Amino acid sequence: SLRILIVDDEKLTRDGLIANINWKALSFDQIDQADDGINAIQIALKHPPNVLLTDVRMPRMDGIELVDNILKLYPDCSVIFMSGYSDKEYLKAAIKFRAIRYVEKPIDPSEIMDALKQSIQTVLQHQAQ
Amino acid sequence: SLRILIVDDEKLTRDGLIANINWKALSFDQIDQADDGINAIQIALKHPPNVLLTDVRMPRMDGIELVDNILKLYPDCSVIFMSGYSDKEYLRAIRYVEKPIDPSEIMDALKQSIQTVLQHQAQQ
């Protein structure tokens, strides 16, 4: 009964993303999704995500600013970023002590399926104390 | 055939695009795709397209160079550009749709582009 929150300003992309993941081997039960940060926060507070998947850059509220408040109130949540050209330098400057999981554009949907298998594992682990 | 030729670096974007196009309400005979400008041309020589839908900036061959080659081999191909802010700035007469793309807008441009081909195909 895990919820995943997929956030990305590009409908084309969340749809490609969902279309390419095999949810029937994963342990999710809910897939929420969000146009933007403000929009994902509204949703998270209604339905706490166990896992968050997001673009690093996003007008008017980065994925960093986003995970940031998400973690604020759900420390227990794993994050997977879909990261671009030099979003990598960026990730490292902002995170620090925390499980930087990312996937390099051009996204390969195999890589994204590991990060997900592993996220789930992490969350189950947190759920253990 | 009425072919659309979709050219994008990212599998998830082509997929999500194709997913979002009510190909019921258009004439396309064939959907074609094509991850870089060169694999594009490689296919356009063998299966001549009627519509080009493409990202402006790309690594090995950006929308712009590609689109120019296609328009040389197929004066009649109509082309749609996905752009988004960054490089709208880089400027007969092509259509484009600004990122983040909404399917509604692409869908419109596809119908307009197909109307243009049909209308003009009717040189019987």
TrEMBL record, chain B:
4-aspartylphosphate carried by residues: 55
Enumerate the subcellular locations listed in this protein's record, separating them with semicolons: Cytoplasm
The lineage's top-level taxon is Bacteria
Q: Which residues form the Response regulatory domain?
A: 3-114
Function of the molecule? May play the central regulatory role in sporulation. It may be an element of the effector pathway responsible for the activation of sporulation genes in response to nutritional stress. Spo0A may act in concert with spo0H (a sigma factor) to control the expression of some genes that are critical to the sporulation process.
Q: What is this protein called?
A: Stage 0 sporulation protein A homolog
Recorded source organism is Lachnoclostridium phytofermentans (strain ATCC 700394 / DSM 18823 / ISDg)
Q: Quote the range of the complete protein represented.
A: 2 to 129 of 531
